[model samples]
Target: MKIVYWSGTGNTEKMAELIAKGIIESGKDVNTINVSDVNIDELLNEDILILGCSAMNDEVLEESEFEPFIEEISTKISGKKVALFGSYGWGDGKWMRDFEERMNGYGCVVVETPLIVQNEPDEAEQDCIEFGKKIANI
Candidate 1:
């Protein structure tokens, strides 16, 4: 399992680490990669993907690194399984909803309900852990 994510203030990054811990507890070796360093070809090889991107301006995905990465892999990643997660400081979880729809558009299966947390993720640490366990099973 792998987590590819972008964090503006480290909230989303914290969630990724906690999720990684859960995956480890579930007996899977998981790697957390910053989206900028991700090798798209290698990422596509994974049987399942764990992706995170915080809600940004106007309840949308981070436009710089994460968004384009998603776009670049969109066409080629049809039928892949994904577990989506992110952090939000304001507004509703519209960003995640839109993201799920986009992944569905690519014919990718979102394995579980996308995890969303407001502000720092440590407040919801256990939830993140369980989410990772769920992802590992997928």
Candidate 2:
């Protein structure tokens, strides 16, 4: 699994690492990489795609970077298996909810409920870990 993520304050980045730890514990090799550093073709070759990003203005995805990346990949990612996670602030997880539908629209089978952390990922470490383990099996 390749976890591609974007984090401004390292909150979402931390979440990705925790998830990767769980994937490793499940006996799978995983890479926790930042979105900007990822190679598009390499990411598409993975059996399971993991993505993390933080909410930005109006409870939406970080527009300048992460959102643009997702839009570009949406075309070729149909029929892919994916798991989504992110950190949010001052909003009901609406961004994650909308993101799930968008991935489904792209013909992706989202493995589990998208995980959302309110602020930093400290409290959500175990949740991210468990989520990754589940994703590894699916």
Candidate 3:
């Protein structure tokens, strides 16, 4: 399993790390990388792919790096198992909702709902961890 994330204010990064830890606890190999540092080729090496980002504007993914990276890899994601997570400061966490939907549209087998946090993660982050373990099984 691999978690690729983009964070502007640390929220998404923290969530990614926690989720990675959970996956590791499941006794599987897991790598968590910043979206900018992830190569698309790495996608082929993982049994599951997890994407994390921070929401910007009303329902947009953070524009700094995650969005562009996804655009590049979306086509390559078909048939791969996937999960999504994100932190949001305002609005409903619709960005991740839409993101999950788009991944499904691309023929990626999304394994869970988008695990969204309001500004920062709390106990809800546990869901992300569980999500990681679940996708690992897929």
Candidate 4:
């Protein structure tokens, strides 16, 4: 599994670490590359993709980077094993819901309900890790 993400306030970045640790604890190895370091074409290199991107202004994807990246890969992720996760400070998680539908339309097998953390409390962190393991196991 590979976790490719973009973090602006550091919260999502920490969650990314917890996610990678979860995969490791599950007896597997994973790679985490900052979104800037990867391109849409490389997503096919892995069987599973664990994507993280926090909702930005107006509860949308970080428009400058993560958004464009997702758009670039949109048509290419058909039938791929993918998981979506991220953080939010305000709003009702419509962002996650919309993103889930977007992936589904692309024919990607979105593994599970997206995990959103309000502020990465210990409980949310643990849940994020567990979900990471679940994705790897699947």
**Candidate 1 vs 2: which has more TM-score:** 1
Model 4, span 1-138: residue lDDT tens: 689999887888888899889999999998888899986667677798789888887778889888898888887888898899888887778888888888889889998888889865466888878888888789
lDDT of 3 at 97: 78
In candidate 1, position 57 carries an lDDT of: 90
Better of 3 and 4 by lDDT: 4
Cα RMSD, model 2: 0.8
Q: What are the runs in model 2 whose C-alpha is more than 4 Å off?
A: none
Model 2: per-residue Cα lDDT over 1-138, one tens digit each? 799999999999989999999999999999998988988999999998999988888878888889989999999999999999999888999889888999999999998889899888787789989988999888
Top-down lDDT ranking: 1, 2, 4, 3
The list of candidate 1 runs beyond 4 A from truth reads: none
By lDDT, the best candidate is: 1
Model 4: ten consecutive residues of lowest lDDT: 119-128
Instruction: List the candidates' TM-scores in order.
Output: 0.98, 0.97, 0.90, 0.94
Runs of candidate 3 with Cα error greater than 4 angstroms are none
Task: Report the C-alpha lDDT of model 3 over 45-134, residue by residue, as the tens digit.
Answer: 676788888888768887768788888887777898888888888678788778988889989988777788887677677876786677
Residue-pair clashes per prediction, in order, are 0, 0, 0, 0
